[PDB]
């Protein structure tokens, strides 16, 4: 009775892919601070 059953191969059907999300900072700079006062005699 060889027709009893069959072997079956399983696959994951609905696969999906996506891209990674990376953060970045736009622009850069630095304003100078102020300091100092004169000594006296």
């Amino acid at each position: 009775a060889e027709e009893g059953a069959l072997v079956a191969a399983v696959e994951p059907g609905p696969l999906a892919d996506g891209a990674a999300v990376r953060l970045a900072l736009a622009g850069e700079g630095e304003a100078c601070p102020l300091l100092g006062s004169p000594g006296a005699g």
């Binding site: 990674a20 999300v21 970045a24 102020l34 300091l35 006062s37 000594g39």
Partner: protein
């Protein structure tokens, strides 16, 4: 003078040495700070990039 000659309760503030810190003493008397910080800006613009 030296460090120890300062009364303890006065050691919890700035101690100026004469004549070494005379400009700093002048600034303190003026009620002005030697360092002036830049004005506070806005938080940086955050850009998103894929990979």
């Amino acid at each position: 003078a030296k460090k120890e000659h300062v009364p303890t309760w006065l050691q919890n503030t700035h101690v100026y040495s004469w004549p070494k810190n005379k400009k700093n003493i002048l600034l303190r008397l003026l009620r002005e700070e030697e360092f002036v910080a830049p004005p506070r800006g806005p938080l940086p613009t955050l850009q998103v990039v894929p990979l």
